[PDB]
């Protein structure tokens, strides 16, 4: 294992986007994970479409697109449905709409999913460096989220209840200070960038190991 880890410096991270009005993180989280292992696996770097699934994973997966979901099921989803499209095809406009999904532009598939054990970080650690960037929720509903500027992120009032879906891309030690590299989905005027530091190894800080899963896309 090493001892920090940063998918961007892979180019497997695709820029921030910002979900705006619509409570869509699951979305942002699933493709983020594919987005991943699709250049893993390719080469190729494409964002994919949030709006796809917002639109078209929905009662089956238990998904109720701007209204919240999982990316888990999302991720059965694009099993089901043999594909995903890029983001450019198929864009996203922070709303419900009708099932928009056109196989003459999926960019990506997926073979199966993983989930993660519940508060285990060393073997979230150990999937986000061997197998790429994995889908988490935390508990991001207090001030001091919503505020963050720098540093790393810690809350005493955090629970392992979580209700934001995000993307760590890796992980590292600011310092003195064990982190968790965390894309969010509220843009670039957000944190850093659009990521935060979240602390790590602090006994499920904000519950960022408690739902952790991750998409394959398999070769044979
Ligand atoms: C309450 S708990 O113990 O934390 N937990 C229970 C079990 C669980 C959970 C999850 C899971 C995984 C990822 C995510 Cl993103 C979520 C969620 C959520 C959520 C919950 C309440 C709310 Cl209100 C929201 C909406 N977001 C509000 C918000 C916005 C900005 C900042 C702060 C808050 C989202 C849940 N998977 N799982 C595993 C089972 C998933 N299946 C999927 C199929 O349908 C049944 C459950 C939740």
Redesign the pocket.
């Known amino acids: 294992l090493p001892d920090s880890v940063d998918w961007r410096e892979k180019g497997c991270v695709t820029e921030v986007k910002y979900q705006g009005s619509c409570?869509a993180?699951?979305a942002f989280?699933a493709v983020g994970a594919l987005e991943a292992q699709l250049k893993l696996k390719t080469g190729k770097l494409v964002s994919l479409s949030a709006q796809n699934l917002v639109d078209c994973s929905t009662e089956k997966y238990?998904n109720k697109g701007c209204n919240?979901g999982?990316?888990?099921?999302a991720f059965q989803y694009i099993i089901d449905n043999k594909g995903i499209d890029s983001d450019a095809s198929y864009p996203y406009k922070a709303m419900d709409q009708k099932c928009q999904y056109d196989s003459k532009y999926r960019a990506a598939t997926c073979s199966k999913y993983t989930e993660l054990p519940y508060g285990r970080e060393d073997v979230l650690k150990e999937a986000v460096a061997n197998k790429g960037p994995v889908s988490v929720?935390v508990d991001?509903?207090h001030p001091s989220?919503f505020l963050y500027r720098s540093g790393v992120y810690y809350e005493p009032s955090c629970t392992q209840?979580?209700?934001?879906?995000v993307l760590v891309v890796g992980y590292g030690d600011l310092n003195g200070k064990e982190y968790w590299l965390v894309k969010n989905s509220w843009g670039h005027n957000f944190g850093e960038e659009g990521y935060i530091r979240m602390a790590r190894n602090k006994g499920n800080h904000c519950?960022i190991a408690?739902?952790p899963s991750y998409p394959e896309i398999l070769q044979g």
């Not at 999982?70 to 099921?73: A, E, H, P, V």
């Not at 209840?161 to 879906?165: A, I, K, L, S, T």
């Open positions: 409570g993180s699951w989280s238990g919240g999982f990316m888990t099921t929720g991001a509903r989220f209840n979580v209700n934001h879906g519950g408690s739902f």
